[PDB]
Amino acid sequence: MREIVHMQAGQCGNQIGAKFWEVISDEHGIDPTGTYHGDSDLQLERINVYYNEATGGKYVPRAVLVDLEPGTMDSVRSGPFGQIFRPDNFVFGQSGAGNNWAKGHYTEGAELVDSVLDVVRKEAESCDCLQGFQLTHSLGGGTGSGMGTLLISKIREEYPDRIMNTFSVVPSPKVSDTVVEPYNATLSVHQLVENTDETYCIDNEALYDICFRTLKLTTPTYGDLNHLVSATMSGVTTCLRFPGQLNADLRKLAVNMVPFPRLHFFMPGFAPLTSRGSQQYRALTVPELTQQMFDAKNMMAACDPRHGRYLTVAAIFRGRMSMKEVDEQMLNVQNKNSSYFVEWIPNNVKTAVCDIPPRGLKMSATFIGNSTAIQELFKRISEQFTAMFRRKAFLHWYTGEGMDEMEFTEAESNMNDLVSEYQQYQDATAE
Amino acid sequence: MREIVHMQAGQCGNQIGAKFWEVISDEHGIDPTGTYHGDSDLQLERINVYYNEATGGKYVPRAVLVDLEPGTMDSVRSGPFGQIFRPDNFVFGQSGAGNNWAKGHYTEGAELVDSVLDVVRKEAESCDCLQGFQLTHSLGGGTGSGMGTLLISKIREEYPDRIMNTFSVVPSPKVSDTVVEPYNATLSVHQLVENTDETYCIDNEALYDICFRTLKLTTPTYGDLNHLVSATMSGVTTCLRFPGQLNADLRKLAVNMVPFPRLHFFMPGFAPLTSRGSQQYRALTVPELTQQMFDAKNMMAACDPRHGRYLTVAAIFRGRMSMKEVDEQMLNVQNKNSSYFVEWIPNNVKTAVCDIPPRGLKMSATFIGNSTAIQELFKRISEQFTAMFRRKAFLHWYTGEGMDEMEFTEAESNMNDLVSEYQQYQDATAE
Amino acid sequence: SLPFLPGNSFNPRLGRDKFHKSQHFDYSNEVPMLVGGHKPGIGGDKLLG
Amino acid sequence: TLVRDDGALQLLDIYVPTSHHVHKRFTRHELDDYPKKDAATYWRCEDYTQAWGH
Amino acid sequence: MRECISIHVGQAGVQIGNACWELYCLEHGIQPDGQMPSDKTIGGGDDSFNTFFSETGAGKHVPRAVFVDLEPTVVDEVRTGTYRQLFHPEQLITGKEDAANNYARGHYTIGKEIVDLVLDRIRKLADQCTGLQGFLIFHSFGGGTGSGFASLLMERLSVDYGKKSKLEFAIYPAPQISTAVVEPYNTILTTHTTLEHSDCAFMVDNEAIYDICRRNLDIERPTYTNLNRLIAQIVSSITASLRFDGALNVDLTEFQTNLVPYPRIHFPLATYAPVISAEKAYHEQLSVAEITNACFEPANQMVKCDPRHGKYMACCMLYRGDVVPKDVNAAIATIKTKRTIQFVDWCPTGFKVGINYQPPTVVPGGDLAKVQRAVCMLSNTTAIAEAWARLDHKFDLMYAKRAFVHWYVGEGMEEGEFSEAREDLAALEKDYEEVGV
Amino acid sequence: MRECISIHVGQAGVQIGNACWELYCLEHGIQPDGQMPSDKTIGGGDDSFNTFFSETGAGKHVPRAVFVDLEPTVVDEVRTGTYRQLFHPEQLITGKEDAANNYARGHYTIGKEIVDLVLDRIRKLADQCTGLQGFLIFHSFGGGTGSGFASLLMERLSVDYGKKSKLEFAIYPAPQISTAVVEPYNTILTTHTTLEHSDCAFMVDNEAIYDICRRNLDIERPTYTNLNRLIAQIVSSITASLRFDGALNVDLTEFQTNLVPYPRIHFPLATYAPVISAEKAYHEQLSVAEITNACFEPANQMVKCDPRHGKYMACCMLYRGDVVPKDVNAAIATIKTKRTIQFVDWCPTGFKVGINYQPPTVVPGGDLAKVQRAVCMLSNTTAIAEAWARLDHKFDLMYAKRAFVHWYVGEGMEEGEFSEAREDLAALEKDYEEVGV
Amino acid sequence: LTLSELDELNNKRPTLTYGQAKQAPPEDFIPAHVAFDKKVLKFNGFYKQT
């Protein structure tokens, strides 16, 4: 029974997971009390992927909730669908580092790693085969970023055969929402590269653009953003839980993506996202799903796919759809936009299809794009990092606790090497 | 028709037997008035193990309550389920022990010894089988220790074949609660080694740890801390007073657990110990019972069982469960941690399953471990006794009642002999 | 908009003026514990369990 | 409780897989109409031998 | 005329006997109160039940078993359960204090206080008997009641009934799985005295039935009920030749004369085929060749002993149901050509088969299915020497330090009896080696 | 009694099995619960099922199939679907983790855990039979279990069973349509077992069947269900000469001998070609000449390579229904005197004509018209080298700069395996082009 | 939506048709040695002799 254990780190990861465990609970017919008020046996047949038996026919999430201060977990518990979580996975410290990667990694965040490792081992012990580990966090703080990467390193050390994947909300090209996010991101990406199997980088600017441009959504708040992210998670993990004509687990996605082991930062996407008053004007068909999936202004990252070449593209479909139409559209987008595709990989598009769509929709589709355009994001973060580092801005908050300049230089060198690798594989020819 | 008489000695012994006779009365469905208000005939079938049928249908506990001052016996008779005891077994002394072992062994407790032996002789004469004698008491008191050891010595003289088990709250690793505790414990474990068939050492600090770190409870008080001892005392003899798949009474436990006549000091364990906010979140199964038993936290007498080796471990399960998982979990523990078991005894686990769980749980388990980790406790008591005895502090209060320091240097030497024997049987190779 | 869906979930906080939190989690002395279970939710509204 | 019989409203069910939908338990009517294996051939209308199934 | 009484001693023996007697009542159509239904017929003659049940004048079939235990728990549960009006009250006889996993306690102190009464009950059964073909004795090698009292009963029965056969249905401890800690002591002291006073001892281990229930019956979490039902099927398949006529009938003395080469090697293995469930029984042909090939599989043995490590002496095949004595010969011819199944060089024909027409009886609310045919395989292998060798290893490992010896020696037992048992079991090692080479 | 064992490996194998055993049951009258009434059997059938199904002796017809998939999704969909009680539970075999489009994870790790269990089930299904003709293996080259595990399994069948004929109905990647990225690697790596562990290697292309469905059956939106139904029709038309009567009926080895000229050349094309919708079948004769010309029309092939760029070497016709040989001979003469059909010079006569007296059966809800005549043509052409070369170039474009190779290297499969598979692919291509010239 | 098109789908309502189309119940198959297991007909005879 292949199954994923889930982890949220930081307040961004906690608020993302607090809606992810709502959308998959609604997919599997789980009321907030924890029971199963479902509609079919193909809602409980693979409910063990994310849930565990407790008592009285009640299902608990297999989720580990991490923070260095119970600020957002109080809101998670107080909100709806917050009483389904077991109150032993709420791992917290009394410190609250906040936006210091060093304080979340080396100092005070590092005495919580033993307890959260103990609870993660306890959750993984109740698993027959343990398909994967997934983590939601952000590269803009110290608890989501630093403690999250510490968790990734420890889990990769304990289980060096498992699909350890992360979503992570990456820092934005506009605004900052955090002054020291260049430092946090360039110290977190250095750990993401060597450890994670794949990372589905999410950008809040792209989410805001999706909310206004594609969903109208005059007052979006963070609920619709977390809903879009959670729908992307559910579409990624759908074929692990529901039957389909072409199943695809996370390992199958990892095989039909990253070709060279240090290139696993993907731009995710979702379809259909129809406007607030355009449903009688839109046509819900497979070509329209394909068009909105491959539309450049529909990704949940702020990296333009037309400024680079798609290495690989994973299209995960859900619903009653004809495979000839699906494969015809997958071939047709490459044939009509062959400029944004590497010639040395024939058929860059992995295709998966499942039979069970989300409730209320006939069809759905998720985009996962490995392109040579996330180098724009890494170039942005590298430039914003070196501008601060050439004048030693905010470096005393790291050197005082115990960091040195060597870690910063190693992280910058590795990240610029990643940028050069992406540029090389963009400029590589067929022969 | 196997049956056991029960004795409570001293303040701690009376206050623990007060809730022992309440928990097992709840198990047997006996009203606080003394009548039977149960719902199953399995309760009434083996009820003569601990109860005598008085005229009118009321069941009287077969217990003798001994204290040198009447306050604690007034307290237990005033407590809930305290009116069920016969007032003819409420022998009191005029004076007070004063936490002096001599005042309770060689003086005033040695004139109440005739009355307690008359009462115990009457209760043991009104029998047909007489399995044995339970003594609930604490080391570190006057009548808890001295009068208790006098009782065990006299009863061992009268009946040198019946199973004698003491439940022995043994003094504390940290803090004091009594200044002459090493004196009393050193003078008492001599008689315990010489006389008792089996002894269940109990620490208040380990009890505090299991009510706080595991059972939460905020303020744990003495009621919960005595309920957690009553659970062990019920689960020892549940196989005696209930049917089961594999039965194991006191003589089976003694024969399987002690390899040598002096190695009869056990640390107990009870392991459906869940927080009140986490009862509805846990799948109460045999593997989780096994994991909670074989945990260093869950012992009730300090002595982290990883500095020594398990000579023998008894596991008494109560519930409708599977013998296959029972034996495979006991085997998996030994195979995974074979370094913590002695190599000259194969399969150091005696199992039992007794069908009927305690009222309120679907299944339960009792852990009885004869580890070599009690060398730490006996060495600590020896060190404290030597520290107070080298300068001869508080020695006039014991030598004014007739004793001499020959007896103290005798008891310390025999404690050291016990420590050396446990060291020898710990680090002994198979060849 | 009965099915849940992305974008079909409006603002539930509109009109509310009291957003008081409650400390569900707190170290007792050195052990982390859930000190809630009787404390209400955001704004003092009653929880389920 | 209604048995699947290829209904217009049963095509709107999203919880039955396509394999279960296309490979279904065929009824007496569905096997006694045109998928009935009667078929006139030369080798049957001229009364050849009925070994092995004809 | 061919009745053979049974003695269920110990808790394991009592529970196994409860399952066995439920199976026998269902086989012969006797209701739990002891009466025929008189409004429906199970089908049969007049002496099919007259090997385990003795008919009374009123029409009540009281059985031919003595349920004895020194502990008042399991026998009282039998006395309270649904088969309470079946057994005679002086058959459910019970001591007052348990023997406490102690062979010396069960053989010297508590056993002698009730062995006279169990001999009296056995004598009163054998007096109304007329054609006694043996004593079945159901027990485990656990300790005390199943070890010491069973041993004492073996010597007393051998003294009283001299030439009468005494078959054992004995539960052997697993190589790794065991309950008690003094089990090597109890097993070696039981073997020391059953080797001199038993004619045959079918060993049925627990871990092997655990494996069988996990793999074949698709129950990865069983209890003792399924184990006792399978042991009941084993003994029913053994004793069905005394109840139902067949093509080839094997008598209880025929088992001993065609299974036991020398009067030291009387420890046959146990195997049942097919141990199949109703969800998968009706999809198989379950032919004679299939059920014969399933007997020689190492995973299907009812003891934890790999037969590929040893050499077969003799196999007793017992076929029940829709079996013609031609497919048995074909299956034996196919098996005897295999080079993996190695027989001893001094036994050219190493098979004795018994064909019976009555199919095995399915128990309602049980785990097995209603099968057309089944077969019970009882084989004498030199591979069983490894169980004795590892028991020697455990006995040496404990007796080197003299652990637990004080419990035995302090209550009427010399210290040299442990060494006597050790040297007899080492002599048995040498005997299996000599008859193997 | 001319039994054949059907082994369906991978999701593509299992779904073909779902669409194929449905056709087999509805052709032989087998209910989904496992009984033949009388009505749905072929007239004079009686035992005509006895090459796909086996009696249990009581009425149950258990199919002779092994469904294998390391992923437990589609096999449990089989276990939940309408043929729930038809299959023996041991015939449907799952792992825990799928190979995830990785030949290494299908062949060296993960997949090297249940191959022995699958082989034991195949051995049970083999010695249940008496006249086993061979094994029909259904899988895909998309990757993982259909390539690595099917490679390992068919390898061990090749070294075990020997003289039994191992037909392969392999699914091939298309020239342009592909549902995965690592399909060129997973298809190059498995050419050895189709090259040296298979007696015949019929291949189908999903894009070609899509084009056939769009042109002929008027389905503008076809799917895997229709694809697998067409494949099942091909296999039924192949195997019906083992089931029913016919004039020149073939028996597997017959058309192997009449089809493969050399041991290295065993990769023919299979065209079932009265393929038409009912509305379009209302306006044609569907005569013998029409259904013979439709096979040689290079737009009704199930592999996207027209044979006009190559030469035919051996064509085996398998006709079904009211097809008198006097019309088949005229159709063969017309085919021989056709311009564009060019036969190789060293094959003067190259037509193995077989006729069966049984028209095709139609599934309710199906997309094919109910015709009375059928042709399944198996032709050995020098035009599958086009598909071989397309695979070769798509593999070389990736292996030039070593994309996705770390996944294969980190799970066994040393780096030289890619070069070795490429080299034997080039050798097979050289053999076909030198035969063509 | 017009009053025409709102009149249905308060009667059709595809959200309330989820999981409503259930499978046909499978009739079981039992062999005749299990269905007629332990079923014996008893008759009483006369059997005169000279």
Ligand SMILES: Nc1nc2c(ncn2[C@@H]2O[C@H](COP(=O)(O)OP(=O)(O)OP(=O)(O)O)[C@@H](O)[C@H]2O)c(=O)[nH]1
């Ligand atoms: N198959 C099976 N084995 C049992 C059963 N009950 C006990 N056993 C076996 O018996 C062994 C334990 O020793 P027992 O036979 O129970 O000892 P006893 O008969 O109760 O005699 P005393 O120990 O003196 O009470 C275990 O290892 C089990 O394998 C049972 O119900 N079924």
Ligand SMILES: Nc1nc2c(ncn2[C@@H]2O[C@H](COP(=O)(O)OP(=O)(O)OP(=O)(O)O)[C@@H](O)[C@H]2O)c(=O)[nH]1
């Ligand atoms: N014709 C047809 N082809 C199918 C079908 N299902 C899958 N395929 C083919 O299978 C290829 C994908 O590889 P799979 O067969 O799914 O891989 P697998 O054998 O299941 O092994 P895994 O990689 O572990 O899943 C696709 O390219 C399809 O061409 C089907 O139902 N009909």
Ligand SMILES: Nc1nc2c(ncn2[C@@H]2O[C@H](COP(=O)(O)OP(=O)(O)O)[C@@H](O)[C@H]2O)c(=O)[nH]1
């Ligand atoms: N999409 C989304 N982003 C969030 C949410 N909460 C915080 N963020 C982002 O997280 C970044 C701040 O990092 P933070 O979560 O505070 O790091 P932490 O201190 O370790 O928890 C900001 O740039 C926000 O855009 C949320 O609920 N949804």
Ligand SMILES: Nc1nc2c(ncn2[C@@H]2O[C@H](COP(=O)(O)OP(=O)(O)O)[C@@H](O)[C@H]2O)c(=O)[nH]1
């Ligand atoms: N478990 C438990 N221990 C107790 C209780 N009351 C006192 N004690 C322990 O008993 C010891 C005192 O022994 P005491 O009963 O006063 O001996 P006495 O003075 O001779 O009667 C102290 O060290 C306490 O730790 C109780 O209610 N429960």
Ligand SMILES: [Mg+2]
């Ligand atoms: Mg017993």
Ligand SMILES: [Mg+2]
């Ligand atoms: Mg698959």
